[PDB]
Every structure is written in C-alpha cells, then in structure tokens.
Design an enzyme around this catalytic site. Structure first.
Site, PDB file in Angstrom:
ATOM      1  N   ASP A 131       1.359  -1.142   0.106  1.00  0.00           N
ATOM      2  CA  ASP A 131      -0.089   0.149  -0.035  1.00  0.00           C
ATOM      3  C   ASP A 131       0.878   0.952  -0.342  1.00  0.00           C
ATOM      4  OD1 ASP A 131      -2.323   2.162   0.183  1.00  0.00           O
ATOM      5  OD2 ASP A 131      -1.861   1.796   2.910  1.00  0.00           O
ATOM      6  N   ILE A 132       1.779   1.372  -1.083  1.00  0.00           N
ATOM      7  CA  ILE A 132       2.595   2.049  -1.767  1.00  0.00           C
ATOM      8  C   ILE A 132       1.802   3.186  -1.981  1.00  0.00           C
ATOM      9  CG2 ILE A 132       4.770   3.372  -2.492  1.00  0.00           C
ATOM     10  CD1 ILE A 132       4.751   0.195  -0.997  1.00  0.00           C
ATOM     11  N   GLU A 133       1.884   5.009  -0.577  1.00  0.00           N
ATOM     12  CA  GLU A 133       1.195   5.810  -1.235  1.00  0.00           C
ATOM     13  C   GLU A 133       1.953   7.002  -1.033  1.00  0.00           C
ATOM     14  OE1 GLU A 133      -1.789   6.485   2.491  1.00  0.00           O
ATOM     15  OE2 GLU A 133      -2.344   4.759   2.325  1.00  0.00           O
ATOM     16  N   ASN A 134       3.214   6.937  -1.347  1.00  0.00           N
ATOM     17  CA  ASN A 134       4.479   8.213  -1.559  1.00  0.00           C
ATOM     18  C   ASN A 134       4.667   8.767  -3.164  1.00  0.00           C
ATOM     19  OD1 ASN A 134       5.603   6.250  -2.463  1.00  0.00           O
ATOM     20  ND2 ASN A 134       8.028   6.208  -0.982  1.00  0.00           N
TER      21      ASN A 134
END
Length: 287
Positions: A131-134
């Site tokens: 859940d990569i959000e950057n």
C-alpha cells in the site's frame, strides 16, 4: 474465488478497533492486511493501540498480534503484512536495495532462518501487501520478484498484493502491478474521480488484468470504505447499488471480491446488520 472479503486492520479508523483475532473469529472476512510496516528499509511498524511493547532498539514487539495471526490461520484466514500507508517514512533508492530488503522481510516476518528480531515471534505472515502512497515506485517490482524466489524455501503458499487507487496507472504501485507477479489488487474506488458513483473505471482494471498483469490470473477487488466516517467520500450505503455493481463486475474470472478500509469500521457499522456481513452475503448470492 469471486467471493472473498479482504479487510485492513491495525490503524483503528473507527476508534473502537478490537484485536485481530476478534475479527478473524467473525466469519465475514477472509483476508486480513496488517496495517502497517510504515517505515523501511530501517524497519518500523505501527498498529495504533494494538501493540505498544518494543525491542530495546524501538522496533515493535507484538505478542498478542503474533498469537492472533496463528489463531486467524488455524481458522483458515490469510494474514498479510501491509507495507506503506500515509507515514512518509519509506523509500527505496534502487532495485538492489529493494532486493536486499526481500531477504530482510523473509527473515523478519516469513520462514527465513536469518537471525533477526521478529516482531511476531514464531508467527509467520501469509505474504505482503504493498500500500505504497508516496508516488515513488522505485524497487517494488524487484522486491516482489525476489520474494517469490524466497517463498520456495517456505512450507505454505504465500501471497503478494497491491493497493492502488482507481486512477490508472497508479503512481505508486503501477510499476509493481505491470512488472511483478501479484495475487490480488485491492483497488481503492473512493476519494477519486473513478469511484463507483463517479466515472467507475473497473473496465480499465479488467483490461489491465487480462492483458498487462504478468499474472493473468490476478484477482481484482472492489475497494470501499467500511463506513461513512472511514473516508471523506465514496461510502456506499445503497444496497441496490452494491447489488448492481457486484452483478456487473462478478461476471469475469478476474473478480476476487471486496476490500474494506478498515475492519474496525466495516464490522461496527450496522445497516442493524454489520456492513461487512451485508457485503459478504451479496458476494455469495451473486456467486
């Protein structure tokens, strides 16, 4: 299957989050995503109020979660550790760094035998969610690919998933989804133009599954908020809309089920039946 429910757990979106095992004993959910390993490569975990003890070096040490992972698994549930979230405290500089990190995850959370501090003691996760959000995509595909090689050393099936938002391609996990073998995509259909009541773009994700995904058998999940307060917008309280949406999308072998942010919200939100129960039942009825 096209009837699985995945729930995120760990970040206590509702305030009233109970133990992980409490939700695994519920029977409404099948896959549990522990949220989150929020710091890496230098490891850091955060599970809100559900784990506070640490090793001397500050890394979380979570004996209740460990016990609960094992309970969950005895009951047939799958429990993946989710990497990322909103922390702003993770990044790979390159593919080699990410490949090293595959080994680290394997030894720290998997069946790796490399001597490391283990936040969950002898409990072993069933895989990893990204859940990569950057909006930095570096390394994840290489990491996933290296993990697959390591999993052969283990004694059970392992799973990799990703949690894109619905705009395609996703700016954080798009490269991962296009270049690695992924089991599940938990696609966020809210807080975006492509939500269910917006310009719903399931069709694009189906094209991705059928023609782009290295794993042709990847399972796509309709990701939703678990209550009105679980996100700013995109919560669906209209059961006829849930029913028609599921009818449209369950018509392919690529449909895996529904993913929910998060357990604390989906289990406690009643409409007087828990929201997660409403969804589990609509899935089985469509099947």
């Amino acid at each position: 299957a096209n009837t699985n429910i995945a729930v995120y757990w760990g970040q206590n979106s509702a305030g009233t989050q109970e133990s992980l095992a409490t939700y695994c004993e519920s029977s409404d959910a099948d896959i549990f995503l522990l949220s989150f390993l929020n710091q890496f490569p230098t490891l850091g975990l955060n599970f809100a109020n559900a784990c506070s003890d640490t090793f001397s070096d500050g890394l979380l040490h979570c004996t209740q979660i460990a016990e609960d992972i094992e309970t969950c698994q005895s009951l047939g549930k799958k429990v993946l550790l989710s990497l990322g979230g909103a922390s702003g405290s993770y990044l790979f500089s390159d593919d080699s760094q990410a490949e090293t990190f595959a080994q680290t995850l394997w030894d720290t959370f998997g069946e790796g035998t490399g001597a490391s501090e283990r936040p969950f003691d002898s409990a072993v996760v069933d895989g990893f969610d990204f859940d990569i959000e950057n909006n930095n995509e570096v390394g994840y595909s290489a990491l996933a690919t290296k993990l697959r090689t390591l999993f052969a050393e283990g004694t059970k099936q392992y799973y990799l998933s990703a949690a894109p938002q619905c705009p395609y391609p996703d700016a954080s996990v798009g490269d991962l989804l296009e270049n690695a073998d992924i089991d599940f995509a938990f696609i966020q259909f809210y807080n975006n133009y492509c939500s269910v009541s917006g310009q719903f773009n399931w069709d694009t994700w189906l094209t991705y599954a059928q023609t782009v995904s290295p794993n042709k058998n990847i399972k796509l999940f309709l990701g939703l908020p678990g209550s009105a307060s679980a996100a700013g917008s995109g919560y669906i309280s209209d059961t006829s809309l849930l029913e028609s949406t599921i009818a449209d999308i369950a018509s392919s072998s690529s449909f895996g089920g529904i993913a929910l942010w998060d357990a604390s919200q989906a289990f406690s939100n009643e409409l007087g039946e828990p929201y997660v129960e409403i969804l589990k039942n609509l899935l089985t009825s469509a099947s």
